[model samples]
Target: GSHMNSVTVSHAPYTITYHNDWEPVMSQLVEFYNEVASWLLRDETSPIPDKFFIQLKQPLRNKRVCVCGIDPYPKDGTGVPFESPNFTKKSIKEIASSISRLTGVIDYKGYNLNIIDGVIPWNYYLSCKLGETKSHAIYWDKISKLLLQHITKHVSVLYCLGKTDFSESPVTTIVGYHPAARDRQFEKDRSFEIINVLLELDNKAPINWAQGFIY
Candidate 1:
């Protein structure tokens, strides 16, 4: 009951990393998105572009670890999920860097990549109002939960970031505070270590946490 009162605590600024090629994977969600797009835009307004925003910093693919975030960027930034600090401020750097170190991967521009396989902004509904954050989470619960279950079956780890209390995933979930929170350390979480244990348990190659630069 009280758990539904909030969704996230990520104050870090986000960036857009959506590629046109990424649109196809979304086709997998056509029926769901298409159906909701009709009902949510109730005013015959713009479209889901204003409501249903794109997800993941990269395309959807299989990866060992998944950084499950709360939702897409609020009003500004790229409609993508999670904060993408360009190492600007202390707060931003702390959050972004820890996420990078934890996953052992960084994108071309030094931002984190959860697309196709790594980072995940569980919620896709995008918008900003006085207090509409809670509403957006409620509206997309089904889709997020469905995707979570499906992704868990593929990955060895489902790292749930932020302050939200989630239901369940088939894989192991290392619950922690959102990196955007002040002084939240991710490296100590032993994310890579845990991922490897489960990964090698099945003969998968352990991830390289040492300076993994993804282009």
Candidate 2:
């Protein structure tokens, strides 16, 4: 069942919503989704969770900046990566806010965060019992045709967070701490600083990381 179709994060005067350009490949996404889930479910009657969402509406092709995240916690039905169900204006538990702080862009749309998934969007985990949310990630791979198209060919400057494999992607990718990880790994690892170098290499303008980032 579809839960929340979209969630708008209100930053006082500004608001943000997830990407919607996915409509072009959505049907193929579901088809590939069911094909994999058939065996993962194994005839168990689990409730289908809400599926399909994006972090910012924009063209996927050659998107200058993108954050690849791993979790959207079941409680946060928005389903977009890094957007936790809850967040403090000054804390990093809600990972996306850290990105805002790191990049110094409060208006998420102005922040221009594409949030390219490591593969397909994270929602289709084959429906799970409570506490077993990520059980299907092991079996999931970059197999969906649409996934291969969007993830590899369309996006750029992927900030692959935590310990996820982007070897399959042929773009300029950097592995970084998920911000929500143990301690201050995000800044300690210099996740934002390193990507600026790549942007310069790609002949794109570098994003200034020095700002009043509450995270």
Candidate 3:
């Protein structure tokens, strides 16, 4: 439920309208974002600088599960797409493959990656740098609300590798005990533990996808 306006673009104001239908989770997200944003802004040093917010294509699943990562900006302001720790087309495929295998879902139904995309409206990005705002928690709240509202309703278990992916509340069933607060640095073992935790949470009937991880 947000829009971006370009201040510098000459021809016309380029506006991209976005919203999500999450009547179920909207209230929690609003409260969550407001609290987190307030806390982040209260401090002057660690205040997060807003870069860009991308929209996702599929809505979040209700009882369904999901995982996401953080936004990584370029060293310079030059807009470049995200490159993961071991970024490669093949690696991305592997990541997606792992997810597909884990979820046993053929297509990313009701999933949106709009927010994940790095190419953002330039003016909005600039506004983030110039604004007195300290954190992107509110933006993340918007994303979370939209994701849950628009995606499936079957999700009860959600997991994320990085701390930046979620807020402290709303997510009730964490896959593992490795809260980002406990582990400042990423650990593969902890990630594996999370994957295993998520796998065990599924109540669906046995499917072929589980075979990939069994062996």
Candidate 4:
């Protein structure tokens, strides 16, 4: 049976919908966390944090392009996909810098964090993990693939960062290294190139930009 729940945040521009059919599995995840709430909840809770499926940078209707990351940071209010409430995180900082530079959109407050920008940060793994849990890893992998399949229907282009991969994605996808670990010159150059491409898409096709990433 499918278990569905939707929440509309007061200050947000879109309704976060938890519409899925894996009721049993989702319940298992919920129960697992509930039982281990003392340990697991310390880092991050279930998929829906603060009743939002994803952190809101811009309205969901205004979303155009998506930048997919590995997962959420296990920090409070930071478990919303590739977003983090703490701007000090290196990975989040780098991604934010790239997006700000490409989009010419200043940070919501003067801080260089991508969460304030319009780029959608889709996490490959919805659930946050602590340490090495092989069985949980496998479960998250399965659920992640299903989640990607579901979101790809609406997204146009998906930029896979770091170890993130969506080989069977229905939408156009580009592979790139994580901006934070731009150790190699090529990796850094390529990330900038991709951001430029995204910027061009936003400029050239505003309509598509409003819908999803193009090219």
Cα displacement (Å) at residue 173, model 4: 0.5
lDDT of 1: 0.47
lDDT by residue (1-215, candidate 4, tens digit) is 13455443332223444544322234433433334334333443334344324442233334445677666544433445544444565665665455455456563432322333344567666545444212134445555665556555545556777754333645667777766664554665456456536556646232221121111
Q: After superposition, how far is residue 127 of candidate 3 from its true place, in Å?
A: 10
Judging by lDDT against the true structure, name the best candidate: 4
Top-TM-score candidate index:
1
- Which segments of candidate 3 are over 4 A away from where they belong? 1-53, 70-154, 162-187, 204-215
Task: Give all TM-scores, in the order shown.
Answer: 0.58, 0.56, 0.35, 0.57
Candidate 2: worst-modelled 10 consecutive residues by lDDT: 8-17
* Candidate 2 lDDT over residue span 129-154, tens digit each: 33454544543443323443565465
Reference-based lDDT, residue 188, model 3: 28
Per-residue lDDT over 1-215 for candidate 1, one digit per residue giving the tens place of the 0 to 100 score? 22111111122111123434344334444445444544444422211243234443333454666766565443333444444445333323444455466665565344444333343444433432323444455545565656566666666667675556343645667776655555445443554357668667867776554333334
For each predicted model, how many residue pairs clash, with residues at least 3 apart or on different chains? 6, 4, 30, 2
Q: What lDDT does each candidate get?
A: 0.47, 0.45, 0.33, 0.48
For candidate 4, report its TM-score.
0.57
Decreasing lDDT order of the candidates: 4, 1, 2, 3
